[PDB]
């Protein structure tokens, strides 16, 4: 076992092998900080996160194991991955805190963005690719957000965050529809895809009532097609009495736009999300021609997701991700 150093970060203590050094912080989300270090192993900068607070509850000892399985299953070029985890801890007993490093990339697309149509085209690419990848392991996202893509100087982009704001969720999830189908993520993409080559945010609502009125506006109420499908009293009648909006022409709105993205952003926002483009089908499109190879669009080995239906104890929780730690086996690059 490495030997650790310790260190006061933002409030927050920070105690991590010495392999890692001129360590930053780059930041803080919801469920942990991050910081950026230096890998004497590797001479590369790498990312590391300390989780906040792991077992602090059995949804966050079961939130923190879903994060360490998902990341030990992500092997691709478009998705993030796990160079290393580790512990301070020496045994189970001591065990409660969590580091999880990554690639640092240096920027997310918030970040970058604020494009002209090729930069667009490589990224929503690779998005595409990462969730053909995701999606094939029967993974759905449920939160792709530019702030949830991390992009280098390269231009290279790596998904993050995601398995289990408002602006690029898909209306099936405002309306608290039981299930989903995995195209609530592509529905997330052309919002971004849109966003890239406009500047604007496609859909900014205030609220979740504001953010469905928008999406009406440019794509149209929907038919009685898509009605037969909404069981809800509830969610039908609202859309039955309201104000009956035709579906806007997509070459009027994204006046200047390449076509053949202007053709994409039609496909991926369809309201209904069994008539959406898939992951697959989207890298096909005539938009990505110059990026599109199927011989190097992988999909995931089988993801065992049944852990999710299980209703545990913290330390339960606890000591199985304890196994997953002790488990990892790193990447040889
Ligand atoms: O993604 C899951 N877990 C997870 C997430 C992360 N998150 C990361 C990583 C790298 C980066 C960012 C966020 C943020 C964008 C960014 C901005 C500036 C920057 O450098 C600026 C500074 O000036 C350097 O010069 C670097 C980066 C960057 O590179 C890190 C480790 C993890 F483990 C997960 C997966 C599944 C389920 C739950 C969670
Ligand atoms: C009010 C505007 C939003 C209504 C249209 C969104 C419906 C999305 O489409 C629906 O998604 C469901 C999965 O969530 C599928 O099971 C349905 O087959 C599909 O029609």
New binding site residues.
């Given amino acids: 076992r490495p030997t650790f150093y310790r260190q006061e970060l933002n409030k927050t203590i920070w105690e991590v092998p010495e392999r890692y050094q001129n360590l930053?912080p780059?930041?803080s989300?919801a469920?942990?900080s991050?910081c950026?270090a230096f890998d004497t192993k590797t001479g590369l900068?790498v990312?590391?996160?300390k989780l906040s607070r792991p077992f602090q509850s059995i949804i966050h000892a079961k939130?923190t194991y879903?994060?360490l399985r998902?990341?030990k299953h992500?092997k691709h070029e478009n998705v993030?991955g796990?160079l290393d985890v580790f512990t301070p801890a020496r045994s189970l007993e001591e065990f409660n805190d969590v580091y999880?490093?990554?690639?640092?990339?240096?920027?997310?697309l918030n970040?970058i963005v604020k494009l002209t149509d090729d930069h667009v085209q490589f990224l929503i690419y690779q998005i595409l690719r990462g969730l053909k990848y995701i999606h094939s392991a029967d993974i759905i996202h449920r939160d792709l957000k530019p702030?949830?893509l991390?992009?280098?100087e390269d231009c290279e982009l790596?998904?993050?965050?995601?398995?289990?704001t408002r602006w690029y969720r898909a209306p099936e999830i405002m309306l608290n529809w039981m299930h989903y189908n995995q195209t609530v993520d592509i529905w997330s993409v052309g919002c971004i895809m849109a966003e890239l080559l406009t500047g604007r945010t496609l859909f900014p609502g205030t609220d979740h009532i504001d953010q469905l009125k928008l999406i009406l506006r440019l794509v149209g109420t929907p038919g009685a097609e898509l009605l037969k499908k909404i069981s809800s009293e509830s969610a039908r009648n609202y859309i039955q009495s309201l104000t009956q909006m035709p579906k806007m022409n997509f070459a009027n709105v994204f006046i200047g736009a390449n076509p053949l993205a202007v053709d994409l952003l039609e496909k991926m926002l369809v309201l209904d999300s069994d008539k959406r483009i898939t992951a697959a089908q989207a890298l096909a499109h005539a938009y990505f021609a110059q990026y599109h190879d199927p011989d190097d669009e992988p999909v995931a080995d089988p993801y065992d997701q049944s852990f999710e239906s299980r209703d545990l104890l913290i330390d339960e929780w606890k000591s199985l991700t304890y196994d997953e730690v002790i488990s990892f086996v790193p990447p040889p690059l």
């Fill in positions: 930053s780059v930041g989300g469920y942990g991050v950026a900068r990312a590391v996160k939130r879903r994060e998902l990341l992500m993030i796990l999880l490093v990554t690639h640092l990339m240096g920027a997310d970040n702030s949830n991390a992009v280098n790596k998904i993050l965050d995601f398995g289990l």
